[PDB]
Amino acid sequence: MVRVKICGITNLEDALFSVESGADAVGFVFYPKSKRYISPEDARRISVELPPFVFRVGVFVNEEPEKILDVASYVQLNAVQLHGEEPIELCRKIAERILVIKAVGVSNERDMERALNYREFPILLDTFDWSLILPYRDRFRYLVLSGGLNPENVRSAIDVVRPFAVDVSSGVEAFPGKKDHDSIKMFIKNAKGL
Numbered sequence: 142m143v144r145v146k147i148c149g150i151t152n153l154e155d156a157l158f159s160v161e162s163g164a165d166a167v168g169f170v171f172y173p174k175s176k177r178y179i180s181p182e183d184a185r186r187i188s189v190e191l192p193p194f195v196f197r198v199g200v201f202v203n204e205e206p207e208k209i210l211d212v213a214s215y216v217q218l219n220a221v222q223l224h225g226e227e228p229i230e231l232c233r234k235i236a237e238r239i240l241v242i243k244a245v246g247v248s249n250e251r252d253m254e255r256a257l258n259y260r261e262f263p264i265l266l267d268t269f270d271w272s273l274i275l276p277y278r279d280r281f282r283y284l285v286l287s288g289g290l291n292p293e294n295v296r297s298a299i300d301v302v303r304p305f306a307v308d309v310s311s312g313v314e315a316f317p318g319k320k321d322h323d324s325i326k327m328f329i330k331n332a333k334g335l
């Protein structure tokens with residue numbers, strides 16, 4: 142069964158609702174220019190109140206390795222999602238202390254060729270024509286499918302690719318920073334086949 146991550150959480154109530162509905166991970170965007178931005182302190186409060194067995198991920202965009210490590214131990218993250226243009230070295234350094242997921246934007250097979258350079262880490266493909274990923278699926282360990290996913294389309298995207306996980310943030314929102322519980326229920330209901 143596919144895993145589901147709900148990203149850009151900015152408040153407790155949305156996070157908890159996510160957990161109770163079946164979400165396997167919850168994410169916080171530590172990129173200052175995002176509308177879904179949340180401060181380490183506010184994130185800490187949420188992190189700390191969540192049950193175990195639910196991953197806490199932090200999204201960073203071209204941040205310097207030390208800041209990544211500090212936010213991570215402070216907020217008690219379980220993984221780090223490197224969503225910029227980070228070189229494998231930075232990736233490899235971060236990975237010595239905590240698990241990293243590398244995000245890579247994709248729109249044509251040239252992009253999939255760039256992604257293969259990071260195949261040693263789990264990949265989040267930020268994408269749509271799912272089938273163009275197919276000839277590359279087995280070159281990767283674990284693949285997180287993302288981009289434009291919503292309750293209406295997740296199942297189709299899951300049938301074509303069969304990924305480890307699926308990620309979403311605006312496709313289940315009422316507005317930037319605030320989730321819509323019915324959409325979350327439906328997104329998880331549909332993606333997992335419950």
Ligand SMILES: O=C(O)c1ccccc1NC[C@H](O)[C@H](O)[C@H](O)COP(=O)(O)O
Nearest residue numbers: 148149175177288289290309310311312
């Ligand atoms: O959500 C944001 O604003 C944001 C900004 C900068 C970096 C990452 C961000 N989101 C983190 C996560 O990887 C995103 O959910 C997906 O790329 C967005 O999928 P969407 O729901 O917009 O299709």
